[PDB]
RNA sequence: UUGACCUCAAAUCAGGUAGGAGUACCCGCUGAACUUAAGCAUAUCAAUAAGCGGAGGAAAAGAAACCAACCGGGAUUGCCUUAGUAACGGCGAGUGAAGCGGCAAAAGCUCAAAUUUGAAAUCUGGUACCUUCGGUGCCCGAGUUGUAAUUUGGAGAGGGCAACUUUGGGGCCGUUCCUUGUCUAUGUUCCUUGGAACAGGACGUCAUAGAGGGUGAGAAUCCCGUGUGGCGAGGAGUGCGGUUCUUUGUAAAGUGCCUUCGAAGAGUCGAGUUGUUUGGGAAUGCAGCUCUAAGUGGGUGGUAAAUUCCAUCUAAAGCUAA
RNA sequence: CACGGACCAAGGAGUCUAACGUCUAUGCGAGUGUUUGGGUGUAAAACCCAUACGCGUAAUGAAAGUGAACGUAGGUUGGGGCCUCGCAAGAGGUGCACAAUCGACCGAUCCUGAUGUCUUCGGAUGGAUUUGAGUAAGAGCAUAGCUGUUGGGACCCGAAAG
RNA sequence: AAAUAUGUAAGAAGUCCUUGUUACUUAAUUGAACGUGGACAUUUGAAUGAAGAGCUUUUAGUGGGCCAUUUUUGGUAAGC
RNA sequence: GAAGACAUUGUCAGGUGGGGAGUUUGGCUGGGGCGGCACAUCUGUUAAACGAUAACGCAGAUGUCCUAAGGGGGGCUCAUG
């Protein structure tokens, strides 16, 4: 769509967009990543501080599969509660009639928190959970059952 | 080089890739031949499904340890748990895992159930001339779907005794991390003179 | 072994109905055999001891199984294969130069 | 001395094979520099250009000395994804994947290692004949330094017990396969200009047939075709559909029970140096020099090595349709 | 009195991708992405679906790993809108988004050290001018295009070379 | 110590009165960082003015410079 | 016949090695080679009453030194005539 391109909008104006008292010279400052630890170090300091160098210990055969941490929280949580009977376990919320939750057979192993929920007793079969997270689960009726 | 503040990208384009770059102009082209492959196969194959039985079995890793998917074969302990052997299982149309086996009972169940299913589904005929034909289904996997065979029941009652789950694995953290270190203090307290 | 059911700990994972694994002929690849051990013994009396074998048998009767031992890692490699080697050597010292 | 064995051979020797082309694409190797870094040796370029060797329609790849560390997964491939991340690097420029997930696609298996030991039971060549991609009457040699048969890691043999089960394969013509041979609706009626009718305007017809072209200008309707199936041809062929000839058969094989056994591939494995390649970093593969192992033992377990098991395949031998 | 340009006709110079940053447009909307593949098709169109995985919501640490409510998600000022009263003006209250700001929430770090302790695990509370690409009742996913991108022939032409 | 150039200052985020918090601090709820409510509308506090005041976004091109004024360095002097 | 487990030959380490490769071989700068550093710096000035402010401008310093010449207090007053 060369139609709405400012090319036809500068055609004949000599310089064609890059000047004539300096212009565009193929690779002016360099090619790819111009002298980072050299003259282009003023572009990294303030805009990209920290690129060059090493950090902490190195990890070998570090698959993100053995480092899988599907974290969730309190503000929502009722997201994994199926709509159909979600309303049933909300207002008419009771014990013995507790909601069974398999978060691993869902894809959210870690269960943490944020903005509370309505006081309801629900079973949550998780993998890992936070300290202050399980704190709020108990005060309402919620429970935890660790599986894998 | 660099022009003001832009995003830092590591692009792989400084070779003969402009010789070995295949834009799929044969995309759905092969998709069509895929049907004709199965279609031509069945033209001489008369009433065969063009696909055998793929077992069921949960995936490994800490990520796929919750989704039981379709496996490969059925081992000699399950072809024997079938009523014959693995040489009779494949000459009919059932998979056989020569290198894999039976590890968890839970799966052996949902599979031997699925074993008698396809075993009552295999409309096999003799080899003389009579051999009676009887329709045919062009499927086997999508025919007996695996929608996570047994996960749990929706309704249950609250069981509160006092575990926290957090402090259970916080000390189970120490259990797993101070196994051999508190075992070196166990041999230390195993030889006092 | 059956896990602990929970996430991590002594046994990380769920403890579901475990089964006892059927026969794996594989793990017993290195089997003694009365056909390989009968014919392996005739090897110790038809070829007997090798130059570096004779060199290391007395090498023991020299400074001990620390001199011929650290010399076997150079005349071989793996420290475990190196001491599996010093094993059949004291076996030839008694079962040959004695009765 | 006679028939000989053991070894090198041997002539336009019988009957046969191997040598080039081609290098879009596979496998090897080889082996860059420019450029990049604003110079440049590091590295990049590039495990790439040229050079060189041997095939195919696919090829290498592929049945585990795999992967993981899971309730574990279960030949490798291709693909999205992983992830331009882990990882390498004056840790400067830059370089950079694999398990499994989704998927298409799906295949299995076979040789040495054993006593045939009541009988070389396995075959070349060649020759009268014959129903021939061959064979029988017959004979040598190959060959007992191991051929048949035997079994092989998923296993499996000898002894017995006491039972059951699976069919083997050609003619005949169709279907399945490749090219196909060929018929195949519709009009040439008229007016207006026109060299000429395929034209401005009509007037009919076909429309499972307005693809397209051609024909003396815009042709759906004139020529071929088209769309649509039919009737024949040359062969392929027992996949399928079965019928006729052959019961071939005191033929072999798979599955169940107890015991004993259970052979499983080496100047290889790994280790120690050089250096090449590198995601692979106190070895990722690889070649060389040297060393030179074992049998509940050994390869792997991505920070070196010592140390008890665990997990995990059975290397070093082979083909294999997508 | 620098340079090309005798003169005329047609080729001929900020192009595309791979992945992105800017501004905005639109579907859905904490979802989204159908199109890798599988069903269908007058047939390369279109149409349909999946399990996926991506990104996002979750961050803070070198990693172990830990992982966001004193409080109506809040104290203080200015604020659009609404509201009510008012002749107007405004008095006054309710003050989204947002701007300045005090404590607080979580990680890492520096501290302290109640509990019990397979006797060194474990670590509430009160804390520190510390601290971070966050929370303070999601805004992204997916697409087209516009200015800039950097890997490539990379605005078009040319070096000695190698 | 001139002229000439220069920074700040001219209000509802202000001033006058009350007095509530603090682990601050003070001999001292003393003071102070900070609020509650009470009094005053544009003579609400010199002049004058505004394609509106304010503010984030975002990317090109330029990063060889040269003349005049007075002050002025070098330099004989310079169209240096 | 000679030479003989030393040479030959396979492989490392060691040495030599512009004979061969590849490359740089600072720049600023009254052109530049040369000197200098007007290069990271800094004393007063140049700077024309804030500040900011060229030049190979000008009269110069910088790479170290001190467990006391430093820290803190106490007593004392120095050059000099």
From Swiss-Prot, chain A:
Subunit note: Component of the large ribosomal subunit (LSU). Mature yeast ribosomes consist of a small (40S) and a large (60S) subunit. The 40S small subunit contains 1 molecule of ribosomal RNA (18S rRNA) and 33 different proteins (encoded by 57 genes). The large 60S subunit contains 3 rRNA molecules (25S, 5.8S and 5S rRNA) and 46 different proteins (encoded by 81 genes).
PANTHER family: 60S RIBOSOMAL PROTEIN L27A, LARGE RIBOSOMAL SUBUNIT PROTEIN UL15
Superkingdom field: Eukaryota
PROSITE patterns: RIBOSOMAL_L15
One of the GO biological process terms: cytoplasmic translation
Chain positions covered by the region annotation Disordered: 1-38
A Pfam family reported for this protein in Swiss-Prot or TrEMBL: Ribosomal_L27A
A cellular component term, taken from the record's GO annotations: cytosolic large ribosomal subunit
Cross-link Glycyl lysine isopeptide (Lys-Gly) (interchain with G-Cter in ubiquitin), sequence positions: 95
Family membership: Belongs to the universal ribosomal protein uL15 family.
Function of the protein: Component of the ribosome, a large ribonucleoprotein complex responsible for the synthesis of proteins in the cell. The small ribosomal subunit (SSU) binds messenger RNAs (mRNAs) and translates the encoded message by selecting cognate aminoacyl-transfer RNA (tRNA) molecules. The large subunit (LSU) contains the ribosomal catalytic site termed the peptidyl transferase center (PTC), which catalyzes the formation of peptide bonds, thereby polymerizing the amino acids delivered by tRNAs into a polypeptide chain.
SUPFAM superfamilies with a match to the protein in the record: Ribosomal proteins L15p and L18e
Location of the motif Nuclear localization signal: 6-12, 23-29
Stretches of the chain forming a coiled coil according to its record: none
Name of the protein in question: Large ribosomal subunit protein uL15
Keyword field: Cytoplasm, Isopeptide bond, Ribonucleoprotein, Ribosomal protein, Ubl conjugation
Biased composition (Basic residues): 1-13, 20-29
GO molecular function, a single term: RNA binding
Location in or out of the cell: Cytoplasm
From Swiss-Prot, chain B:
Quaternary data: Component of the large ribosomal subunit (LSU). Mature yeast ribosomes consist of a small (40S) and a large (60S) subunit. The 40S small subunit contains 1 molecule of ribosomal RNA (18S rRNA) and 33 different proteins (encoded by 57 genes). The large 60S subunit contains 3 rRNA molecules (25S, 5.8S and 5S rRNA) and 46 different proteins (encoded by 81 genes).
Pfam families in the cross-refs: Ribosomal_L13e
Note: Present with 133000 molecules/cell in log phase SD medium. There are 2 genes for eL13 in yeast.
Superkingdom of the source species: Eukaryota
Keyword Cytoplasm belongs to the record: yes
Compartment list: Cytoplasm
Function: Component of the ribosome, a large ribonucleoprotein complex responsible for the synthesis of proteins in the cell. The small ribosomal subunit (SSU) binds messenger RNAs (mRNAs) and translates the encoded message by selecting cognate aminoacyl-transfer RNA (tRNA) molecules. The large subunit (LSU) contains the ribosomal catalytic site termed the peptidyl transferase center (PTC), which catalyzes the formation of peptide bonds, thereby polymerizing the amino acids delivered by tRNAs into a polypeptide chain.
GO terms under biological process: cytoplasmic translation
Record's keyword annotation contains Phosphoprotein: yes
Organism listed in the record: Saccharomyces cerevisiae (strain ATCC 204508 / S288c) (Baker's yeast)
Keywords associated with the record: Cytoplasm, Phosphoprotein, Ribonucleoprotein, Ribosomal protein
Family: Belongs to the eukaryotic ribosomal protein eL13 family.
GO molecular function, one term: RNA binding
Protein name as it appears in the record: Large ribosomal subunit protein eL13A
GO cellular component terms listed in the entry, alphabetical order: cytosol; cytosolic large ribosomal subunit
Xref: Gene3D superfamilies: 1.20.5.110
Principal localisation: cytoplasm
Modified residues (Phosphothreonine): 143, 151
Swiss-Prot record, chain C:
Disulphide linkage map: none
Residues found modified as N-acetylthreonine: 1
Molecular-function annotations in GO: RNA binding; structural constituent of ribosome
Keyword line: Acetylation, Cytoplasm, Ribonucleoprotein, Ribosomal protein
GO cellular component terms given for this protein: cytosol; cytosolic large ribosomal subunit
Note: Present with 31600 molecules/cell in log phase SD medium.
Official protein name in the record: Large ribosomal subunit protein eL36A
Organism: Saccharomyces cerevisiae (strain ATCC 204508 / S288c) (Baker's yeast)
Lineage: Eukaryota, Fungi, Dikarya, Ascomycota, Saccharomycotina
């Amino acid at each position: 769509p060369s139609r709405f391109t400012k090319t036809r909008k500068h055609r004949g104006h000599v310089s064609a967009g890059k000047g004539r008292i300096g212009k565009h010279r193929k690779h002016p400052g360099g090619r790819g990543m111009a002298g980072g630890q050299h003259h282009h170090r003023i572009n990294m300091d303030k805009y990209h501080p920290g690129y060059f160098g090493k950090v902490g210990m190195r990890y070998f055969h570090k698959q993100q599969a053995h480092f899988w941490k599907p974290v969730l929280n309190l503000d929502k949580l009722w997201t994994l509660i199926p709509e159909d009977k979600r309303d049933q376990y909300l207002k008419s919320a009771s014990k013995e009639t507790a909601p069974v939750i398999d978060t691993l057979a869902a894809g959210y192993g870690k269960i943490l928190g944020k903005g509370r929920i309505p006081n309801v007793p629900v079973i949550v079969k998780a993998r890992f959970v936070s300290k202050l997270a399980e704190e709020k689960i108990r005060a309402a009726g919620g429970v935890v059952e660790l599986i894998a | 080089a660099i022009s003001k503040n832009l995003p830092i990208l590591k692009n792989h384009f400084r070779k003969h890739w402009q010789e070995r770059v295949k834009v799929h102009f044969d995309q759905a082209g092969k998709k069509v031949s895929r049907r004709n492959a199965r279609a031509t196969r069945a033209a001489k194959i008369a009433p065969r499904p063009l696909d055998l039985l793929r077992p069921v079995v949960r995936a490994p890793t800490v990520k796929y340890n919750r989704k039981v998917r379709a496996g490969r074969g059925f081992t000699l302990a399950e072809v024997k748990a079938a009523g014959l052997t693995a040489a009779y299982a494949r000459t009919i149309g059932i998979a056989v895992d020569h290198r894999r086996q039976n590890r968890n009972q839970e799966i052996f169940d949902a599979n031997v159930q699925r074993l008698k299913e396809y075993q009552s589904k295999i409309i096999v005929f003799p080899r003389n001339g009579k051999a009676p034909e009887a329709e045919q289904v062009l499927s086997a996997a999508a025919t007996f779907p695996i929608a996570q065979p047994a996960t749990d029941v929706e309704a249950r009652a609250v069981q509160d005794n006092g575990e926290s789950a957090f402090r259970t694995l916080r000390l189970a953290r120490s259990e797993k991390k101070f196994r051999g270190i508190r075992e070196k203090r166990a041999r230390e307290k195993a030889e006092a003179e | 072994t059956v896990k602990t059911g929970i996430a991590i700990g002594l046994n990380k994972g769920k403890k579901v109905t475990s089964m006892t694994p059927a026969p794996k002929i594989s793990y017993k690849k290195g089997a003694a055999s009365n056909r390989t051990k009968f014919v392996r013994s005739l090897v110790r009396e038809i070829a007997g001891l090798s130059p570096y074998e004779r060199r290391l048998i007395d090498l023991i009767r020299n400074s001990g199984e620390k001199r011929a031992r650290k010399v076997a890692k150079k005349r071989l490699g793996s420290f475990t294969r190196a001491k599996a080697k010093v094993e059949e050597m004291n076996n030839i010292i008694a079962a040959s130069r004695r009765h």
